[PDB]
Coordinates of C-alpha atoms in Angstrom, one line a residue:
Chain A
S1329 CA 72.3 -44.3 -26.5
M1330 CA 68.5 -44.0 -25.8
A1331 CA 65.4 -43.4 -27.9
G1332 CA 61.6 -44.2 -27.5
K1333 CA 61.4 -47.9 -26.3
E1334 CA 59.7 -46.9 -23.1
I1335 CA 57.1 -44.7 -24.3
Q1336 CA 53.7 -45.6 -23.2
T1337 CA 52.0 -42.2 -22.8
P1338 CA 51.5 -38.9 -24.9
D1339 CA 53.6 -37.0 -22.3
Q1340 CA 56.5 -39.3 -22.8
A1341 CA 56.0 -39.1 -26.6
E1342 CA 56.1 -35.3 -26.6
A1343 CA 59.3 -35.3 -24.5
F1344 CA 61.0 -37.6 -27.1
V1345 CA 59.8 -35.5 -30.0
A1346 CA 61.4 -32.5 -28.2
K1347 CA 64.6 -34.5 -27.7
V1348 CA 64.7 -35.5 -31.3
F1349 CA 64.3 -31.9 -32.6
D1350 CA 66.7 -30.8 -30.1
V1351 CA 69.1 -33.3 -31.9
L1352 CA 68.2 -32.6 -35.5
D1353 CA 68.1 -28.6 -35.0
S1354 CA 71.7 -28.8 -33.6
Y1355 CA 73.0 -30.4 -36.6
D1356 CA 75.0 -32.7 -34.5
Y1357 CA 75.0 -35.5 -37.0
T1358 CA 77.1 -37.8 -34.7
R1359 CA 73.9 -38.0 -32.3
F1360 CA 71.4 -38.5 -35.1
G1361 CA 71.8 -42.3 -34.7
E1362 CA 70.8 -42.1 -31.1
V1363 CA 67.2 -41.6 -32.0
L1364 CA 66.9 -42.5 -35.8
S1365 CA 66.9 -45.8 -37.3
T1366 CA 69.6 -46.9 -39.6
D1367 CA 66.7 -47.8 -42.1
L1368 CA 64.8 -44.3 -41.4
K1369 CA 62.2 -43.6 -44.1
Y1370 CA 61.9 -39.8 -44.0
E1371 CA 59.5 -37.6 -46.1
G1372 CA 59.4 -33.8 -46.0
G1373 CA 57.3 -32.8 -48.9
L1374 CA 58.5 -34.0 -52.1
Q1375 CA 61.9 -34.7 -50.7
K1376 CA 62.2 -38.4 -49.5
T1377 CA 65.2 -40.5 -48.2
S1378 CA 65.6 -44.1 -47.3
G1379 CA 68.4 -44.9 -44.7
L1380 CA 70.1 -43.0 -42.1
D1381 CA 73.2 -42.0 -44.2
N1382 CA 71.0 -40.7 -46.9
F1383 CA 69.0 -38.5 -44.4
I1384 CA 72.3 -37.1 -42.9
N1385 CA 73.7 -36.3 -46.3
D1386 CA 70.4 -34.5 -47.4
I1387 CA 70.5 -32.3 -44.2
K1388 CA 74.2 -31.5 -44.7
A1389 CA 73.4 -30.5 -48.3
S1390 CA 70.7 -28.1 -47.2
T1391 CA 73.3 -26.3 -44.9
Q1392 CA 75.3 -25.8 -48.0
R1393 CA 72.5 -24.4 -50.0
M1394 CA 72.0 -21.9 -47.3
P1395 CA 75.0 -20.9 -45.5
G1396 CA 74.1 -19.5 -41.8
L1397 CA 70.9 -21.5 -41.7
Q1398 CA 69.4 -21.7 -38.2
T1399 CA 66.1 -23.8 -37.3
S1400 CA 64.1 -24.4 -34.4
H1401 CA 60.8 -26.2 -33.6
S1402 CA 58.2 -25.9 -30.9
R1403 CA 55.1 -28.1 -30.2
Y1404 CA 51.7 -27.6 -28.7
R1405 CA 49.9 -30.8 -29.1
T1406 CA 50.9 -34.5 -29.3
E1407 CA 49.0 -37.7 -29.4
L1408 CA 50.2 -41.1 -29.1
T1409 CA 47.8 -43.7 -30.8
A1410 CA 47.0 -47.5 -30.2
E1411 CA 48.8 -48.2 -33.3
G1412 CA 52.0 -46.6 -31.8
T1413 CA 52.0 -43.5 -34.0
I1414 CA 53.2 -40.3 -32.6
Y1415 CA 51.5 -37.2 -34.1
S1416 CA 53.1 -33.9 -32.9
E1417 CA 51.7 -30.4 -34.1
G1418 CA 53.7 -27.4 -33.7
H1419 CA 55.6 -24.6 -35.5
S1420 CA 58.9 -24.6 -37.6
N1421 CA 61.1 -21.4 -37.5
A1422 CA 64.1 -20.6 -39.6
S1423 CA 66.3 -17.5 -39.9
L1424 CA 70.0 -16.9 -41.4
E1425 CA 73.0 -15.9 -39.2
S1426 CA 73.6 -13.0 -41.8
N1427 CA 70.0 -11.5 -41.1
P1428 CA 68.9 -12.7 -37.7
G1429 CA 66.0 -10.4 -37.3
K1430 CA 64.0 -12.1 -40.3
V1431 CA 62.2 -15.3 -38.9
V1432 CA 60.2 -17.4 -40.9
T1433 CA 57.5 -19.5 -39.0
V1434 CA 55.0 -22.0 -40.2
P1435 CA 52.7 -24.5 -38.7
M1436 CA 53.9 -28.1 -39.0
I1437 CA 53.2 -31.6 -37.9
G1438 CA 55.4 -34.6 -37.6
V1439 CA 54.3 -38.1 -38.0
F1440 CA 56.6 -40.7 -36.2
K1441 CA 56.6 -44.5 -36.1
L1442 CA 59.0 -46.4 -33.8
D1443 CA 60.9 -49.6 -34.3
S1444 CA 59.7 -52.1 -32.0
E1445 CA 63.1 -53.6 -31.3
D1446 CA 64.8 -50.5 -30.1
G1447 CA 62.4 -47.5 -30.0
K1448 CA 64.2 -45.5 -32.5
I1449 CA 62.3 -43.6 -35.1
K1450 CA 61.9 -45.8 -38.3
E1451 CA 59.3 -43.4 -40.3
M1452 CA 59.4 -39.6 -39.9
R1453 CA 57.0 -37.5 -42.1
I1454 CA 57.0 -33.7 -41.6
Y1455 CA 54.4 -31.5 -43.1
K1456 CA 54.7 -28.0 -43.5
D1457 CA 54.3 -25.2 -46.1
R1458 CA 57.8 -24.4 -47.3
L1459 CA 56.8 -21.6 -49.8
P1460 CA 57.1 -18.8 -46.9
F1461 CA 60.8 -19.8 -46.5
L1462 CA 61.7 -18.3 -50.2
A1463 CA 61.5 -15.0 -48.1
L1464 CA 64.9 -16.0 -46.6
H1465 CA 68.0 -14.3 -48.3
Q1466 CA 68.9 -16.3 -51.5
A1467 CA 66.5 -18.9 -50.8
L1468 CA 65.9 -18.6 -54.6
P1469 CA 68.2 -16.3 -56.2
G1470 CA 66.7 -13.9 -58.6
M1471 CA 63.2 -13.6 -57.0
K1472 CA 60.9 -16.7 -56.7
Chain B
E1309 CA 38.6 -1.8 -36.4
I1310 CA 38.9 -5.2 -34.6
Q1311 CA 35.8 -7.1 -34.4
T1312 CA 36.6 -10.6 -35.3
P1313 CA 39.2 -13.2 -33.5
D1314 CA 40.9 -13.5 -36.9
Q1315 CA 41.5 -9.6 -37.0
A1316 CA 42.6 -9.8 -33.4
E1317 CA 45.3 -12.4 -34.1
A1318 CA 46.5 -10.4 -37.1
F1319 CA 46.9 -7.5 -35.0
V1320 CA 48.8 -9.3 -32.2
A1321 CA 51.1 -10.8 -34.9
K1322 CA 51.8 -7.3 -36.0
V1323 CA 52.4 -6.2 -32.7
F1324 CA 55.1 -8.9 -31.7
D1325 CA 56.6 -8.1 -35.2
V1326 CA 57.3 -4.6 -34.1
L1327 CA 58.4 -5.6 -30.4
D1328 CA 60.6 -8.6 -31.8
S1329 CA 62.2 -6.1 -34.1
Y1330 CA 63.0 -3.7 -31.1
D1331 CA 61.5 -0.9 -33.5
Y1332 CA 61.3 1.4 -30.4
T1333 CA 60.3 4.5 -32.6
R1334 CA 57.3 2.5 -34.1
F1335 CA 55.9 1.1 -30.8
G1336 CA 53.7 4.2 -30.5
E1337 CA 51.8 3.0 -33.7
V1338 CA 50.4 0.0 -31.7
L1339 CA 50.9 0.9 -28.1
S1340 CA 49.2 3.6 -26.0
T1341 CA 51.1 6.6 -24.6
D1342 CA 49.4 5.4 -21.3
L1343 CA 50.3 1.8 -21.8
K1344 CA 50.0 -0.4 -18.5
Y1345 CA 52.4 -3.3 -19.1
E1346 CA 53.2 -6.3 -16.8
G1347 CA 55.6 -9.1 -17.5
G1348 CA 56.2 -11.2 -14.4
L1349 CA 57.8 -8.9 -11.9
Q1350 CA 58.5 -6.2 -14.6
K1351 CA 55.8 -3.6 -14.5
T1352 CA 55.6 -0.2 -16.2
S1353 CA 53.2 2.7 -16.8
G1354 CA 53.6 5.0 -19.7
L1355 CA 55.1 4.2 -23.2
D1356 CA 58.3 5.9 -22.5
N1357 CA 58.8 3.8 -19.4
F1358 CA 58.0 0.6 -21.3
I1359 CA 60.5 1.4 -24.2
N1360 CA 63.2 2.1 -21.2
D1361 CA 62.3 -1.3 -19.5
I1362 CA 62.9 -3.0 -22.9
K1363 CA 66.0 -1.0 -23.8
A1364 CA 67.4 -2.1 -20.3
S1365 CA 67.0 -5.7 -21.1
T1366 CA 68.6 -5.7 -24.3
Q1367 CA 71.7 -3.9 -23.0
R1368 CA 72.1 -6.3 -20.2
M1369 CA 72.0 -9.3 -22.7
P1370 CA 73.9 -8.2 -25.7
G1371 CA 72.8 -10.2 -29.0
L1372 CA 69.5 -11.2 -27.8
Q1373 CA 67.0 -12.4 -30.5
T1374 CA 63.3 -13.0 -30.0
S1375 CA 60.4 -14.3 -31.9
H1376 CA 56.8 -15.5 -30.9
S1377 CA 54.2 -17.8 -32.6
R1378 CA 50.6 -18.3 -31.6
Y1379 CA 48.3 -20.9 -31.9
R1380 CA 44.8 -19.8 -30.7
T1381 CA 43.5 -16.4 -30.0
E1382 CA 40.1 -15.1 -28.6
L1383 CA 38.5 -11.7 -28.6
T1384 CA 36.0 -11.2 -25.9
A1385 CA 32.6 -9.3 -25.9
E1386 CA 34.5 -6.9 -23.5
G1387 CA 37.1 -6.1 -26.1
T1388 CA 39.8 -8.2 -24.6
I1389 CA 42.3 -10.2 -26.6
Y1390 CA 43.7 -13.5 -25.2
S1391 CA 46.5 -15.1 -27.3
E1392 CA 48.2 -18.4 -26.4
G1393 CA 51.6 -19.2 -28.2
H1394 CA 55.3 -19.6 -27.7
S1395 CA 58.2 -17.3 -26.9
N1396 CA 61.5 -18.0 -28.4
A1397 CA 64.9 -16.6 -27.4
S1398 CA 68.4 -17.1 -28.8
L1399 CA 71.7 -15.3 -28.7
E1400 CA 73.6 -13.9 -31.7
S1401 CA 76.8 -15.1 -29.9
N1402 CA 75.3 -18.7 -29.4
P1403 CA 74.1 -20.1 -32.6
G1404 CA 72.1 -23.0 -32.3
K1405 CA 70.8 -22.6 -28.7
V1406 CA 67.2 -21.6 -28.7
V1407 CA 65.0 -21.6 -25.7
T1408 CA 61.1 -21.9 -26.2
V1409 CA 58.5 -21.5 -23.5
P1410 CA 54.7 -21.3 -23.7
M1411 CA 53.0 -17.9 -23.2
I1412 CA 49.9 -16.0 -23.1
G1413 CA 49.1 -12.3 -23.8
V1414 CA 46.3 -10.3 -22.4
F1415 CA 45.6 -7.3 -24.4
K1416 CA 42.9 -4.3 -23.8
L1417 CA 42.6 -1.8 -26.6
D1418 CA 41.8 2.1 -26.4
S1419 CA 38.6 2.7 -27.7
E1420 CA 39.5 6.0 -29.5
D1421 CA 42.3 4.8 -31.6
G1422 CA 42.8 1.0 -31.1
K1423 CA 46.1 1.0 -29.6
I1424 CA 47.1 -1.4 -26.8
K1425 CA 46.4 0.3 -23.6
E1426 CA 47.0 -2.7 -21.3
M1427 CA 49.2 -5.5 -22.0
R1428 CA 50.1 -8.5 -19.7
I1429 CA 52.5 -11.2 -20.8
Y1430 CA 52.8 -14.3 -18.8
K1431 CA 55.6 -16.9 -19.2
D1432 CA 58.3 -18.7 -17.2
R1433 CA 61.5 -17.1 -17.4
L1434 CA 63.5 -19.9 -15.5
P1435 CA 64.3 -22.0 -18.7
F1436 CA 66.2 -18.9 -20.3
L1437 CA 68.9 -19.4 -17.7
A1438 CA 70.1 -22.0 -20.4
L1439 CA 70.6 -19.4 -23.1
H1440 CA 74.5 -18.8 -22.7
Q1441 CA 75.1 -22.7 -22.5
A1442 CA 76.9 -24.4 -25.5

C-alpha cells in the first residue's frame, strides 16, 4: 500500500517509524510487505536476514521460542539525514502473556534506509542489549 | 539519600515499579502518608486517598497493565525531581494493543525520610480511548 516515499522531514520520518513498529509488533505478517522491501537487509545483533520472506520466518520462529511474547516500542528522538538515513532512538519493551506484570525495557535505536523507487525499508538495523530479556520466563531454561 | 540525578532516576524507577505493580501495601515505602498527588483532573491528599483513587481506576478498567520508561531526569538545587519519559498501557483482554504517550513526573521529597510528599504526573489521556480497539 504506502511506505516512506514522501518523507522529506524528520517529523514525517518518525511517523513512518511508528507506523512500521505498529505493523511489526502486531505480528500481522500479511502487512509487513507494505513497509518492508522484498530485498530487506535486516540486522538485530548477531541475527541477520536477507529478503522479506526470511525476515518473516525469523520473526515467526521467535514467537515459537517464546509462546505469549508481547512486544512494543516507543521513540523519543529521530533524525533524517541528507543521505536519507533515518535514525530513531527509543525503548523496546517485552513481556509474556503468562506473566504480564514482568516487563523488560531497554533503550534501542533503529537505523533505516529506504528504497528510492518506492520508499519501503531496504535496510533495517536495530541495536539494543538483549541480555536483560533473559529475565523473561524460559528465555533460557535452566538459568542463563 | 538522593544527591545526584542518577540516584534520583534510580529512585523514580523504583517508585514506578511499585506503582505499576499495584503493590498497594508497599506504596508507603516510597510515598508520604501526607502525599499530595495530581494527575490531570485526578487530585488526592493523603496516601490512603491516593490508594483508593488508584484502586477505583483498576476496578473500572479490568485487566489494565501499565509500565513506564524514562529518558531524562534532573534533580534541582531545591530538591525537585523532574523526569521525562513514556507511559504505556494495555489490557490483558486485548493483547497486542499498546498505547504509549509522553509523560513527565514532578516529585518533591520529605526531608525527614526521603519519601515522595508531592507527585504531579502530566500526560495526555486522550490516546488511551483506543485501548479496547482490535
